[PDB]
Amino acid sequence: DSFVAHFREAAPYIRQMRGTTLVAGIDGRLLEGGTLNKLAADIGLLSQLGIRLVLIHGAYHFLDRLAAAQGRTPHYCRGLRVTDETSLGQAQQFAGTVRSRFEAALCGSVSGFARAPSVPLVSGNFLTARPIGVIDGTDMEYAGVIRKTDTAALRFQLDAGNIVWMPPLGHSYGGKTFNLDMVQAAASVAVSLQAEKLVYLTLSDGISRPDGTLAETLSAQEAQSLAEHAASETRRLISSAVAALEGGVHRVQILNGAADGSLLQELFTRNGIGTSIAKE
Amino acid sequence: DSFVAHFREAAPYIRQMRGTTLVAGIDGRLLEGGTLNKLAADIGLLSQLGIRLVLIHGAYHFLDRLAAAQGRTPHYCRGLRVTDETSLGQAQQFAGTVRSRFEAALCGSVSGFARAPSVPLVSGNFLT
Amino acid sequence: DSFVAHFREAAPYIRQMRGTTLVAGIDGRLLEGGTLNKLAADIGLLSQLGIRLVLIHGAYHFLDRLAAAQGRTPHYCRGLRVTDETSLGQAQQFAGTVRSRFEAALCGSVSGFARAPSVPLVSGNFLTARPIGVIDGTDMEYAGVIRKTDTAALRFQLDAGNIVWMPPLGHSYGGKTFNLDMVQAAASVAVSLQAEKLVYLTLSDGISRPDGTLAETLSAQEAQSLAEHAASETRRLISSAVAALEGGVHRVQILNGAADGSLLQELFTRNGIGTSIAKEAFVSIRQAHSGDIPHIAALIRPLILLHRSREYLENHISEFSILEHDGNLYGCAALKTFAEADCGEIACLAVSPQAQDGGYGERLLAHIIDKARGIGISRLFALSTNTGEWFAERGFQTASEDELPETRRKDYRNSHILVRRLHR
Amino acid sequence: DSFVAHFREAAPYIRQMRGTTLVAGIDGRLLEGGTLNKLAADIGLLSQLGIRLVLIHGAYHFLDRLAAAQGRTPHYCRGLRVTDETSLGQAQQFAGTVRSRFEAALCGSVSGFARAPSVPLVSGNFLTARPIGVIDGTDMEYAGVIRKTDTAALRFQLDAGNIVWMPPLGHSYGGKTFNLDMVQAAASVAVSLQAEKLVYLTLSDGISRPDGTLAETLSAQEAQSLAEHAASETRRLISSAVAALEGGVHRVQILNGAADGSLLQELFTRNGIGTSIAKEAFVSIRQAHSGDIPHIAALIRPLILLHRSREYLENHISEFSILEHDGNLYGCAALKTFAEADCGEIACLAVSPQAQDGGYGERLLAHIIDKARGIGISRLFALSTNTGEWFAERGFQTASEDELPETRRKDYRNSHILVRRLHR
Ligand SMILES: CC(C)(COP(=O)(O)OP(=O)(O)OC[C@H]1O[C@@H](n2cnc3c(N)ncnc32)[C@H](O)[C@@H]1OP(=O)(O)O)[C@H](O)C(=O)NCCC(=O)NCCS
Ligand SMILES: CC(C)(COP(=O)(O)OP(=O)(O)OC[C@H]1O[C@@H](n2cnc3c(N)ncnc32)[C@H](O)[C@@H]1OP(=O)(O)O)[C@H](O)C(=O)NCCC(=O)NCCS
Ligand SMILES: NC(=[NH2+])NCCC[C@H](N)C(=O)O
Ligand SMILES: NC(=[NH2+])NCCC[C@H](N)C(=O)O
Ligand SMILES: NC(=[NH2+])NCCC[C@H](N)C(=O)O
């Protein structure tokens, strides 16, 4: 269509998004190739439209490849990862590497043809975690869950215009580090700060129905139906999205982070691409 | 010496440090042992006394000890270390590990016997 | 001790005191000699550590000496001074003189060797007073009591960093001045602004017991006991301290203002010098929360302890109890339970060397046997590799592994196994 | 009178008005001649004394003349104007012209001899209106009523020191303009922002009584009485004033905007010119508090009075009553009581010379005999050295000391002792 027709459709969403909080749970796999640079440039723009952004990457696939590649097969126990000392150790390393990689991409990306101000990015000690403990007799070791979240520190960073970067790691009162599950920690953080949007950036178009068709919009009730017999990965997502919706998050959106402009199509058009989920 | 003699000498400097900026460059070897804990604890204390703290850690020893262990020999020119792809890779990794290690010590430590607020730490794309 | 050890003890109190409000009722007699200069320098420092300070001097002794010296013997009527026009008149004069004297001392004092900013001091019309009237037929004349206090003006001065100076005088809506009683007006002001501390600077070490020993800490209940038969001066103090505590003041402290550094020893050490008074007993035992884990960890490090990778401390924090004295966490203990309902285990009993040999362990043991009895459990176990003698001296007999609960016997495969039978 | 006497009367009102909000409904007719310039200069001054001002002009007379002059006779339907497209059209034009005219007058007016800053004036889209619809079968066309008012925008303009100018027009969600009725929209706006004053500037002195006399003060109840049979114009006013009072506006004042200085006489003197209206009767009698002591003292000074050292005024304030008119404390009286339960004494009856010979004393006497009867007491005494004739004319007979209560007889050892017997 014409430029005007598209702008008439985008502009209201710009009015609405500005000042809004959006929590992005980003798949670890997206933070490397040509995609990283694409994500960073688009995430940059959102920041520049005044959306308050909290970013959280995942790491299970990288930890899973890395383990296999060195002899130890990874154990999941009713769905959550067992994380031993070595893995924890590599998890800290991975967060370091992905953090750097993202700052660089952010620094070297462009928004258009004119010169923009640079984009401020921040991390800190916002999440205090605790060990899950033992499940079905199995020790979950350094697998952890959010205990306490420094919501006031987050709001403070966000009110100042900063993008907040969180790794799937937390510290404990007992002085140790724990591996968090990103899909869940993003849901939990979003509930904590009453975020208007929780966005999962995945390698998939969103939630497909048993017949292949991309869902598109789901109520929580319909989402739980879909989850009955579906892949534990799509099951985890939905379990977490519904919990977010239950806690007050307005919308949870699931997209393909490897598809060019996905984020901009989802947030600024009425149909979006991907799957939108709401309480009712 | 007595408490009051010690408090008397210390108190002026508290008055002076509050609102002061202190940039600390910390040897990377310092962020592992019981020294970590002992350190994190005191940085923790400084922070509660209103000092403004900017911590910057080193890596050269880590990277050189990581080289020896794997056959490579570190090359320095005019004090500064030559840094290959692989080394840069190892540094981003090391940073991850030490930033976590330090956060955990901080969270797990104590100023005194009374319950106190937790100490906020922040990082960011400050350096181009 | 070393500098470091002293600083480790003072620093937390500096974190805590800053932003805090402290009301000082200062004895008139302290505002003259070498002591004045000492007080002023120390009060200066406190101001410089960001403590919010409201100062109020007394005057009865000066008014009492001055009257005697000119023929009129002073009348107290059930404890409070009768203040006639002449005395009132001299009271206004005295406040003037003591005010000047204090500014000068403040101005000319030093805090250390380096150059500090000067210390701002302020007074104003904060107290509106009213006449007590007549008691037992006697006219109290210009003796007065606080009617209304400009709390918002005070907070305003204090938020700006000013020391506030109040004389024991107030004005009335009827356009006259009244003599206040300092001990009481300080209590009243402190209640008004919900001050964390009310400090009485006296010519005495604090409240002594009938046997001479300095008290040290008192609950309000114990303080009122002491007051039954004691000097009307120590009686007035306690009557006012208890009222402050009743109104919300956290602590009321009584010291010797003529003893060098008193104020600094009281406020920045755990023991203090002098007498500390609180609404309830110092020492309480409460249920632990995630927030206490680091204190419990630090209370355990000095050992005799598993606790490296993840924890039982994390997920079972709720079954720990901690002992605190005056806000300091000095001990902890846990009660572990079993598939067997009549069993339990006391675990992690620890009191820091700092507070040790003072009865706290035993208070923790008493507390957890009560918790255990409260839920059935008739046999309480302790397994320990070194602390056996303590429990053995305290009702625990040695037991054999064959007496352990299933899971515990499994674990124990290794030191002294002791039990004590409890009364349901 | 002297300059000082006038300034003593104006100054308090300046303290009070500043920060206050005042909504002025101005008659359209006032916005043209020599009067416009007068209004603008006075309105300027008010602005400069920090009064928050919201101005709203009327237009019915101009719309009514304009219609007649071009053949169409104006229809009112149960009191409100029918406004057709043409009229609406002219109404927009009129608001434009009156707006300009007012800015010019404001710009070119002066406040005194020295040079003042200019006076900021602002309008915007604060009122969203809706059509009244149909009444008694008649279509009211573009006649409208306030639907929604942007109170936050108004407060914002006002906090910044701006005079706000509103025309009697509003827009609708349906995208059309409507004619508002000024008298009503001013009442509605005033209720919306909880204004302390709603002022109607008219071509009349205020509300006259059926006999010609200017009213002056009215309670709402009395105002509604007056409205029963009066001109629909004075009826509209009162209907709107009462609604404002009902919604929280403190006072509604009605004056002559064409009388020089009217506004300044109304707002800064105790009597005003014009008509003041309040929710409840002006004049109330309430129980005294410590806060009134200075007013009572000042009410007593002019005498006949003990009251030097300390007071009975201080500690027995609770037994005083004060009479106020429109917020002014003009009188007081006390009831003193006795070991004898059937006795009492009226003491300190005082009404300031300023408000005297206006019935207040007697209202205070009536009030305290009711208090006294409410507690038994069948004999009320007054002892007075000069005011005997007043009480003697008002049911008090002379009594002998032998009738006094014990304590009172003791005290009296000396002027006229009078009593009045009361009905239990
Ligand atoms: C056991 C302990 C916690 C009790 O603490 P406490 O606060 O001193 O308790 P109390 O003051 O009630 O008891 C003091 C008495 O116990 C004595 N005591 C200390 N350790 C003892 C031991 N191992 N065996 C016997 N008695 C001991 C003290 O010398 C003191 O003796 P006294 O009263 O004749 O002067 C003790 O303080 C301690 O030393 N704890 C060390 C760490 C620990 O206990 N770890 C694990 C325990 S399961
Ligand atoms: C007595 C007093 C308080 C009553 O006040 P008030 O508000 O005028 O009361 P009212 O208006 O109901 O009474 C007005 C009438 O009282 C009259 N009056 C005033 N003082 C009087 C007196 N000493 N003797 C007789 N009548 C007197 C006024 O002239 C007026 O007469 P009028 O109604 O025929 O015109 C009076 O106002 C007064 O002058 N008070 C002076 C101070 C005082 O009273 N001190 C102590 C009293 S115990
Ligand atoms: N998959 C969808 N149906 N998306 C609708 C998105 C609507 C809107 N632009 C938003 O970001 O919330
Ligand atoms: N006399 C005492 N026991 N004093 C204890 C003082 C403890 C603490 N430093 C305070 O100022 O409150
Ligand atoms: N008409 C009257 N009675 N006016 C009294 C006005 C009193 C006061 N100055 C005011 O503006 O409210």
Side-chain angles (χ1 to χ4, degrees):
Chain A
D1 210 319
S2 66
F3 171 85
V4 172
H6 285 133
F7 189 82
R8 297 233 175 81
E9 173 174 20
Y13 287 117
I14 296 152
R15 195 273 308 342
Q16 308 189 36
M17 296 292 307
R18 172 171 168 204
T20 269
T21 304
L22 194 168
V23 186
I26 307 158
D27 193 292
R29 276 123 83 243
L30 285 171
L31 305 165
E32 35 191 63
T35 55
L36 207 210
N37 294 317
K38 298 269 328 210
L39 223 66
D42 277 1
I43 285 178
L45 256 194
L46 300 192
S47 165
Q48 285 179 340
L49 313 177
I51 297 142
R52 297 148 58 95
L53 297 150
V54 174
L55 303 180
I56 318 178
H57 69 92
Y60 281 4
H61 297 263
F62 171 90
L63 298 167
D64 276 3
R65 227 162 82 258
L66 225 245
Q70 71 195 23
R72 25 182 213 92
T73 88
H75 330 81
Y76 287 74
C77 188
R78 224 165 177 188
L80 258 87
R81 211 188 128 100
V82 184
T83 299
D84 61 31
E85 203 169 342
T86 289
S87 267
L88 197 270
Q90 289 142 172
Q92 288 157 334
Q93 297 175 351
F94 178 64
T97 128
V98 157
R99 187 176 199 241
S100 298
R101 226 125 89 160
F102 193 85
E103 315 198 349
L106 204 57
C107 181
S109 47
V110 276
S111 74
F113 288 95
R115 231 148 98 17
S118 43
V119 176
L121 175 142
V122 135
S123 290
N125 57 357
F126 310 117
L127 296 182
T128 129
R130 89 163 195 285
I132 288 158
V134 159
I135 287 171
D136 284 310
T138 308
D139 184 4
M140 300 297 282
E141 310 187 32
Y142 294 91
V145 108
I146 278 156
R147 190 200 281 284
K148 272 173 182 195
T149 160
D150 192 352
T151 288
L154 286 167
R155 296 219 185 77
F156 174 82
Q157 289 316 144
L158 295 158
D159 293 337
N162 298 138
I163 307 167
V164 171
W165 180 273
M166 302 175 199
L169 294 169
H171 48 84
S172 62
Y173 286 122
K176 297 272 147 145
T177 307
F178 293 97
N179 205 82
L180 306 169
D181 172 11
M182 175 275 301
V183 168
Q184 178 176 125
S188 156
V189 167
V191 164
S192 272
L193 81 219
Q194 297 294 281
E196 282 78 2
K197 290 193 191 295
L198 171 56
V199 169
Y200 293 112
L201 298 180
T202 75
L203 272 61
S204 294
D205 293 326
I207 289 133
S208 273
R209 295 190 205 94
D211 340 72
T213 53
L214 162 64
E216 203 145 318
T217 74
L218 281 170
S219 68
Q221 154 155 219
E222 305 156 351
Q224 309 176 90
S225 303
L226 271 181
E228 279 217 354
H229 297 113
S232 52
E233 199 157 52
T234 141
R235 173 83 212 70
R236 300 211 299 89
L237 279 190
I238 290 195
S239 160
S240 265
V242 165
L245 291 166
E246 235 99 309
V249 177
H250 288 30
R251 280 297 179 282
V252 25
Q253 285 150 281
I254 324 286
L255 333 160
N256 188 359
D260 322 53
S262 258
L263 257 181
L264 267 28
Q265 188 94 30
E266 179 66 21
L267 303 175
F268 303 98
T269 74
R270 296 186 290 275
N271 302 161
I273 13 67
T275 283
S276 185
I277 317 199
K279 176 55 187 136
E280 271 298 342
Chain B
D1 216 334
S2 67
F3 184 82
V4 169
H6 287 146
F7 190 85
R8 288 269 183 48
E9 156 172 16
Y13 285 111
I14 286 153
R15 196 247 344 287
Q16 296 180 66
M17 304 278 313
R18 179 174 139 198
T20 273
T21 297
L22 172 175
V23 176
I26 306 161
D27 203 287
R29 285 126 83 212
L30 279 176
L31 320 154
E32 69 212 332
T35 74
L36 212 190
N37 289 321
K38 292 266 301 154
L39 197 40
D42 291 343
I43 274 137
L45 226 210
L46 295 186
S47 167
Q48 288 170 320
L49 289 174
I51 299 166
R52 305 149 55 94
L53 296 156
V54 174
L55 321 168
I56 305 184
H57 70 88
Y60 280 3
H61 302 293
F62 182 72
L63 294 147
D64 294 346
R65 202 178 67 256
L66 224 251
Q70 50 190 30
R72 295 190 297 103
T73 76
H75 288 95
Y76 284 88
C77 156
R78 193 157 259 115
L80 309 115
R81 177 160 160 140
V82 165
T83 302
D84 61 28
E85 200 156 356
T86 300
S87 290
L88 197 285
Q90 289 155 177
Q92 305 177 340
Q93 285 168 57
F94 182 66
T97 136
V98 155
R99 187 200 204 249
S100 301
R101 235 113 94 145
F102 179 93
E103 278 191 20
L106 191 61
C107 172
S109 64
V110 284
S111 83
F113 293 105
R115 229 148 105 25
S118 63
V119 190
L121 182 145
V122 157
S123 269
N125 63 2
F126 304 118
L127 296 179
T128 126
Chain C
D1 210 319
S2 66
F3 171 85
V4 172
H6 285 133
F7 189 82
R8 297 233 175 81
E9 173 174 20
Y13 287 117
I14 296 152
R15 195 273 308 342
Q16 308 189 36
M17 296 292 307
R18 172 171 168 204
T20 269
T21 304
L22 194 168
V23 186
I26 307 158
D27 193 292
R29 276 123 83 243
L30 285 171
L31 305 165
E32 35 191 63
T35 55
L36 207 210
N37 294 317
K38 298 269 328 210
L39 223 66
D42 277 1
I43 285 178
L45 256 194
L46 300 192
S47 165
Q48 285 179 340
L49 313 177
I51 297 142
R52 297 148 58 95
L53 297 150
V54 174
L55 303 180
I56 318 178
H57 69 92
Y60 281 4
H61 297 263
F62 171 90
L63 298 166
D64 276 3
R65 227 162 82 258
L66 225 245
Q70 71 195 23
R72 25 182 213 92
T73 88
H75 330 81
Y76 287 74
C77 188
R78 224 165 177 188
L80 258 87
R81 211 188 128 100
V82 184
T83 299
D84 61 31
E85 203 169 342
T86 289
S87 267
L88 197 270
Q90 289 142 172
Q92 288 157 334
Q93 297 175 351
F94 178 64
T97 128
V98 157
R99 187 176 199 241
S100 298
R101 226 125 89 160
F102 193 85
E103 315 198 349
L106 204 57
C107 181
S109 47
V110 276
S111 74
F113 288 95
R115 231 148 98 17
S118 43
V119 176
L121 175 141
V122 135
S123 290
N125 57 357
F126 310 117
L127 296 182
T128 129
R130 89 163 195 285
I132 288 158
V134 159
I135 287 171
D136 284 310
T138 308
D139 184 4
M140 300 297 282
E141 310 187 32
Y142 294 91
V145 108
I146 278 156
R147 190 200 281 284
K148 272 173 182 195
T149 160
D150 192 352
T151 288
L154 286 167
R155 296 219 185 77
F156 174 82
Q157 289 316 144
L158 295 158
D159 293 337
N162 298 138
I163 307 167
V164 171
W165 180 273
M166 302 175 199
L169 294 169
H171 48 84
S172 62
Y173 286 122
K176 297 272 147 145
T177 307
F178 293 97
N179 205 82
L180 306 169
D181 172 11
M182 175 275 301
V183 168
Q184 178 176 125
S188 156
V189 167
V191 164
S192 272
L193 81 219
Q194 297 294 281
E196 282 78 2
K197 290 193 191 295
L198 171 56
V199 169
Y200 293 112
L201 298 180
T202 75
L203 272 61
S204 294
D205 293 326
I207 289 133
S208 273
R209 295 190 205 94
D211 340 72
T213 53
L214 162 64
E216 203 145 318
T217 74
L218 281 170
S219 68
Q221 154 155 219
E222 305 156 351
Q224 309 176 90
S225 303
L226 271 181
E228 279 217 354
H229 297 113
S232 52
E233 199 157 52
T234 141
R235 173 83 212 70
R236 300 211 299 89
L237 279 190
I238 290 195
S239 160
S240 265
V242 165
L245 291 166
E246 235 99 309
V249 177
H250 288 30
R251 280 297 179 282
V252 25
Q253 285 150 281
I254 324 286
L255 333 160
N256 188 359
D260 322 53
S262 258
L263 257 181
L264 267 28
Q265 188 94 30
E266 179 66 21
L267 303 175
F268 303 98
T269 74
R270 296 186 290 275
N271 302 161
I273 13 67
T275 283
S276 185
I277 317 199
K279 176 55 187 136
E280 271 298 342
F282 294 70
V283 195
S284 58
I285 304 179
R286 50 177 256 257
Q287 139 87 279
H289 290 114
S290 59
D292 310 315
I293 292 176
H295 295 273
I296 291 176
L299 223 48
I300 262 92
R301 273 160 215 221
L303 278 176
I304 337 178
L305 64 321
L306 202 295
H307 311 64
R308 77 282 254 94
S309 26
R310 52 93 287 252
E311 330 284 15
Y312 152 90
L313 225 192
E314 298 282 357
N315 290 327
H316 299 103
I317 193 53
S318 80
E319 67 187 34
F320 271 83
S321 287
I322 70 236
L323 187 137
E324 34 178 286
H325 178 78
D326 202 9
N328 309 291
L329 326 209
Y330 283 136
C332 66
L335 178 58
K336 277 161 42 188
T337 67
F338 306 102
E340 299 96 338
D342 67 321
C343 292
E345 165 170 7
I346 170 149
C348 294
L349 179 59
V351 183
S352 70
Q354 317 258 30
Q356 198 163 307
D357 288 24
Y360 296 162
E362 157 108 48
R363 289 158 83 125
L364 283 166
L365 164 69
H367 176 93
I368 62 87
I369 93 134
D370 284 9
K371 176 177 197 175
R373 145 190 326 204
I375 48 139
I377 303 193
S378 25
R379 295 192 298 158
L380 187 72
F381 288 83
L383 307 76
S384 167
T385 167
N386 43 204
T387 310
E389 223 130 330
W390 197 88
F391 292 93
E393 251 151 36
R394 219 95 39 177
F396 292 66
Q397 297 109 298
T398 132
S400 70
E401 89 193 338
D402 263 5
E403 305 187 22
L404 287 182
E406 221 99 323
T407 61
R408 200 53 189 83
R409 197 181 321 101
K410 204 62 211 74
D411 292 23
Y412 169 82
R413 7 183 178 173
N414 216 281
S415 276
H416 292 127
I417 141 65
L418 312 149
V419 224
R420 181 183 163 165
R421 174 108 35 206
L422 317 171
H423 174 49
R424 55 218 72 111
Chain D
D1 210 319
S2 66
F3 171 85
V4 172
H6 285 133
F7 189 82
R8 297 233 175 81
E9 173 174 20
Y13 287 117
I14 296 152
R15 195 273 308 342
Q16 308 189 36
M17 296 292 307
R18 172 171 168 204
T20 269
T21 304
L22 194 168
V23 186
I26 307 158
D27 193 292
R29 276 123 83 243
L30 285 171
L31 305 165
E32 35 191 63
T35 55
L36 207 210
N37 294 317
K38 298 269 328 210
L39 223 66
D42 277 1
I43 285 178
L45 256 194
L46 300 192
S47 165
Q48 285 179 340
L49 313 177
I51 297 142
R52 297 148 58 95
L53 297 150
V54 174
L55 303 180
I56 318 178
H57 69 92
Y60 281 4
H61 297 263
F62 171 90
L63 298 166
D64 276 3
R65 227 162 82 258
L66 225 245
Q70 71 195 23
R72 25 182 213 92
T73 88
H75 330 81
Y76 287 74
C77 188
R78 224 165 177 188
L80 258 87
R81 211 188 128 100
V82 184
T83 299
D84 61 31
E85 203 169 342
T86 289
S87 267
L88 197 270
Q90 289 142 172
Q92 288 157 334
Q93 297 175 351
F94 178 64
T97 128
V98 157
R99 187 176 199 241
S100 298
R101 226 125 89 160
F102 193 85
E103 315 198 349
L106 204 57
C107 181
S109 47
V110 276
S111 74
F113 288 95
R115 231 148 98 17
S118 43
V119 176
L121 175 141
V122 135
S123 290
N125 57 357
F126 310 117
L127 296 182
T128 129
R130 89 163 195 285
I132 288 158
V134 159
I135 287 171
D136 284 310
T138 308
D139 184 4
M140 300 297 282
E141 310 187 32
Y142 294 91
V145 108
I146 278 156
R147 190 200 281 284
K148 272 173 182 195
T149 160
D150 192 352
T151 288
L154 286 167
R155 296 219 185 77
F156 174 82
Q157 289 316 144
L158 295 158
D159 293 337
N162 298 138
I163 307 167
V164 171
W165 180 273
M166 302 175 199
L169 294 169
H171 48 84
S172 62
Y173 286 122
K176 297 272 147 145
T177 307
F178 293 97
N179 205 82
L180 306 169
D181 172 11
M182 175 275 301
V183 168
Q184 178 176 125
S188 156
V189 167
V191 164
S192 272
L193 81 219
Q194 297 294 281
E196 282 78 2
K197 290 193 191 295
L198 171 56
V199 169
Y200 293 112
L201 298 180
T202 75
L203 272 61
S204 294
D205 293 326
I207 289 133
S208 273
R209 295 190 205 94
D211 340 72
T213 53
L214 162 64
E216 203 145 318
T217 74
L218 281 170
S219 68
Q221 154 155 219
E222 305 156 351
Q224 309 176 90
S225 303
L226 271 181
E228 279 217 354
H229 297 113
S232 52
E233 199 157 52
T234 141
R235 173 83 212 70
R236 300 211 299 89
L237 279 190
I238 290 195
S239 160
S240 265
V242 165
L245 291 166
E246 235 99 309
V249 177
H250 288 30
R251 280 297 179 282
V252 25
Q253 285 150 281
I254 324 286
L255 333 160
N256 188 359
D260 322 53
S262 258
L263 257 181
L264 267 28
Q265 188 94 30
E266 179 66 21
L267 303 175
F268 303 98
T269 74
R270 296 186 290 275
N271 302 161
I273 13 67
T275 283
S276 185
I277 317 199
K279 176 55 187 136
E280 271 298 342
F282 294 70
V283 195
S284 58
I285 304 179
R286 50 177 256 257
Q287 139 87 279
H289 290 114
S290 59
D292 310 315
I293 292 176
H295 295 273
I296 291 176
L299 223 48
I300 262 92
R301 273 160 215 221
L303 278 176
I304 337 178
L305 64 321
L306 202 295
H307 311 64
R308 77 282 254 94
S309 26
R310 52 93 287 252
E311 330 284 15
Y312 152 90
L313 225 192
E314 298 282 357
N315 290 327
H316 299 103
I317 193 53
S318 80
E319 67 187 34
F320 271 83
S321 287
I322 70 236
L323 187 137
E324 34 178 286
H325 178 78
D326 202 9
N328 309 291
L329 326 209
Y330 283 136
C332 66
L335 178 58
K336 277 161 42 188
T337 67
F338 306 102
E340 299 96 338
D342 67 321
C343 292
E345 165 170 7
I346 170 149
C348 294
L349 179 59
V351 183
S352 70
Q354 317 258 30
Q356 198 163 307
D357 288 24
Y360 296 162
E362 157 108 48
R363 289 158 83 125
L364 283 166
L365 164 69
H367 176 93
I368 62 87
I369 93 134
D370 284 9
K371 176 177 197 175
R373 145 190 326 204
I375 48 139
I377 303 193
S378 25
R379 295 192 298 158
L380 187 72
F381 288 83
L383 307 76
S384 167
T385 167
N386 43 204
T387 310
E389 223 130 330
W390 197 88
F391 292 93
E393 251 151 36
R394 219 95 39 177
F396 292 66
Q397 297 109 298
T398 132
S400 70
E401 89 193 338
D402 263 5
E403 305 187 22
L404 287 182
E406 221 99 323
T407 61
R408 200 53 189 83
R409 197 181 321 101
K410 204 62 211 74
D411 292 23
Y412 169 82
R413 7 183 178 173
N414 216 281
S415 276
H416 292 127
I417 141 65
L418 312 149
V419 224
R420 181 183 163 165
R421 174 108 35 206
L422 317 171
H423 174 49
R424 55 218 72 111

